[PDB]
Assembly symmetry: C5
C-alpha cells in the first residue's frame, strides 16, 4: 500500500550519519512510508548498493519504490574529496535516469564539520529529511506519468 | 501545435517563478501547448523527463519536446558544482540517447544577482531562451524525420 | 564519389559563427566535399542534432559521411561556461565512438572574445578549417579500416 | 566458503604500492578471505583489468566474489594528475554498477608524498585495508540482496 | 605469431610526436612485437580511430592484439586544454573497459613545451615507450585471464 523505500547510508562520520538518518526516517515516518536501512562504508559504494537492490528484486527479492542516499564528504587537503563527491553523485544521477527510479540525494559535500552539522541536523537545515521528501516527491511523479 | 513538458526545479521559489514566466511566454507566443511539472531540485530534472518517456511508451502523454528550468547558485560549499555538473551532464546524454528535443534552462550562477539577471524575462530571459531552443530543436527533429 | 558532410553550427555569437563557418566551407570546398548546414541555438544542442541526423538516416533520410561541429563558448563571470564547454565536447567525443562516426571538433572554448577571433578567423588560426579538415581525415580512416 | 577476491594493483610508486598491498592483504587475511594479486603499470589500467577478469569468468575462468583496487597518484606540475585520478576512479565506479560487482576503492589521490604515506601506511590511515574491508562489506551486501 | 599492436598517433606537434612514436616503436621492436601506425590530427580523434579499428575487425579486417595511443596537449591560455586532455582520455579509458581491449595511454598533458620534451624523449622519461610496454602488459593480462 504505502511506499516502501531503501535508505542507503554511507556511514563514514558516525555522528553526522545519525543526524542525516534521524531526519531521513522522520520525513518518511510522517508521510506514513516504510523502509529498510543498509549501511555502506563510503559514499562511493552507494550507487552499487542500489544496483544490488535492483538485481535482487529481479530475482523475487524485495521491491522498493524509491531510494534515499545519505552521506557526508568533508573537504580536507586531498583531492580525494572531489573524487568521492563527483563519482558518488555522478553514478547516482545516471542510475536514476537509466533505471527510471525515484532517488532522493542526501549526500553532503561541505568544506568542514561546521557546515556539515548545519545541514545534517534535523532541527537545522535537515537535508536528510529534504532528501527523503524529494524521493517521495519523485515516487509521486513516477506514478503520475505511468512510468 | 507542439505540446511540450516544462520540468521546473523549484529550489528558489521566486527565481523559479521568473524562469517559468519567461518560458511560458515564449511558448504561448509560439502557439505551442504545454504541461508543467515540479521537482524539488535540479538533480531530479533528468529522471523526471525519463519518467515522462516511460509513461508515454505505455500509452501515456506524448511530448514533442521538453524545457528544463532550474537554478543553482554557488554557496560556500562544493555542492554547487555537483548539482550543476550532474544535472546538466545527465540532461545532455538524455537528449542524445533518446533523440529528444530539450531546452536547457538550468542557471549555474555565482551569486543571487546573476541569478536575477538571467531569470528575468525583462533581462537575459534564459527561461524563454530555453523554450525557444526546445522549439527549434523540435523543428530539427522533424526536418530530419528522426 | 565525394563525401557529403553535415555542418552543425551553434549560433550564439553570430559574428564568430560566420568566422568559423567560412573557414569550414572553405576547407570542404577546397577538397571537393559537399555539405548540408544546420543551425542550433547553443553548443549544447550540437550532439542531439547529430543524433537526429543519425536517426533520420535510418529512416531513408540523408546519409552523411562525416560531421563538422562548430561552436564558441566564451567564459563569463559564471560557471555556466564550464558546463556548456564540458557537456558539448563530452557528448561529441562520446558520439563519435558509440556510433563510430567521423567528427571534426570545431567548438571554441576561450577566455575572452579577443581569443575567440584568433581561433575563429580563417585569416588567423582558422579552427573552422582545422575542424573541417579533421572530419575529412576521419572519413578517410573510417574507410581504410573497413567500417 | 570464504570469499575469493582479486587484488588489482597499479604499481607506479613501488614503495607506496607495497604499503597499500600490505594493508590490503592484512585485512583480507584477518577476514579469512583468499585472493589473487595482479599487477598493472598505472591506475589507468585498473578498471580494464577487472573487465578482463569478468570476461575470463564468463569463459570458465576464475570467479571472484569481489575486487580491491589499489593505486596512488601524487599531484606534480602537470594536469596529468587530474586525468589519471579522474578516469581511473570514474570507470571504476561505473563498472561497479553496470556489472553489479563488489569493488573496494583504494586508489590514492594526493597532493604530495607526505599525504601519500599518511594514507598508504597500515600503521596510519591504512587506506589499503579500509578498501579490502569495503570490498568485503559489499560482497556481503550483494549476497544479502541476492543480486 | 607475436602480438600485433596498432599505434594511433595524434600528430599535432610534429616534433614531439616523432619523439613519442620513436620511444613506442623501440619498446615494441625490443619486445619483438609488430604493429601498424595510423595518424590522426588531434588527441580527440584517437578513441574514435580505435573504434573504427574494432568495427573493421568485425568486417573481416586486421585483428589487433592491443593499442598504443600517442598524443601531447600543451596548456595555452584557453580552456581548450582541459577539454582535449579530459575527453581523449575519458573516451579512451571507457573504451578499454566497454570493449575489453589492451590500451597503452601515451597522451601527454603538460603545461609547457619543455615539460613535454622530458616526457616525450626516449633518452628521458620515455612516456612513449612506457605506454607501449603498458599495452604489452595488458595484452599479457588479457591472455592470462582468458578474456
Ligand atoms: O562518504 C565519504 N566517504 C569517504 N571514503 C571514500 C569512499 O567513499 C569509500 O569509503 C572507500 O574509498 C573504498 O570504497 C570519504 N573520504 O575519504 O574522505 C568522505 O569524506 N566521505
Ligand atoms: O536546483 C538546485 N537544487 C539544489 N538542491 C540539490 C538537489 O537538486 C536535490 O534537490 C536533492 O539534493 C536530492 O533530491 C541546490 N542546493 O542544494 O544548493 C541549488 O542551488 N539548486
Ligand atoms: O554555443 C554557446 N551556447 C551558449 N548557450 C548555452 C546552450 O548552448 C543552449 O543554447 C541553451 O542553454 C538551452 O538549450 C553559451 N552561453 O550561454 O554562454 C556560449 O558561450 N556558447
Ligand atoms: O597509478 C598511477 N599511474 C600513473 N601513470 C599513468 C597511467 O596510470 C598509466 O600508467 C599509462 O599512462 C598508460 O596506460 C601516474 N602518473 O603518471 O602520475 C600516477 O600517479 N599513478
Ligand atoms: O592532440 C592535440 N590536439 C589539439 N586539437 C584538439 C582536437 O584534438 C582536434 O585536433 C580538432 O579539435 C577537431 O577534431 C590540441 N590543441 O588544440 O591545442 C593539442 O594540444 N593537442
Ligand atoms: Ca520483482
Ligand atoms: Ca505513446
Ligand atoms: Ca554588480
Ligand atoms: Ca546575433
Ligand atoms: Ca563461471
Ligand atoms: Ca606536515
Amino acid at each position: 500500500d504505502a511506499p516502501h523505500l531503501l535508505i542507503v547510508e554511507a556511514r563514514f562520520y558516525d555522528d553526522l550519519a545519525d543526524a542525516l538518518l534521524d531526519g531521513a526516517k522522520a520525513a518518511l515516518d510522517e508521510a506514513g512510508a516504510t523502509y529498510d536501512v543498509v549501511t555502506v562504508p563510503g559514499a562511493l559504494e552507494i550507487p552499487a548498493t542500489i544496483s544490488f537492490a535492483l538485481d535482487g528484486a529481479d530475482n523475487g527479492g524485495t521491491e522498493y519504490d524509491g531510494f534515499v542516499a545519505l552521506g557526508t564528504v568533508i573537504r580536507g587537503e586531498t583531492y580525494h574529496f572531489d573524487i568521492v563527491s563527483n563519482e558518488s553523485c555522478r553514478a547516482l544521477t545516471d542510475l536514476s535516469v537509466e533505471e527510471s527510479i525515484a532517488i532522493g540525494n542526501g549526500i553532503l559535500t561541505v568544506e568542514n564539520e561546521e557546515q556539515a552539522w548545519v545541514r545534517a541536523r534535523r532541527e537545522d537545515k535537515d537535508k536528510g529529511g529534504f532528501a527523503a521528501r524529494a524521493a517521495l516527491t519523485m515516487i509521486g511523479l513516477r506514478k503520475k506519468f505511468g512510468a
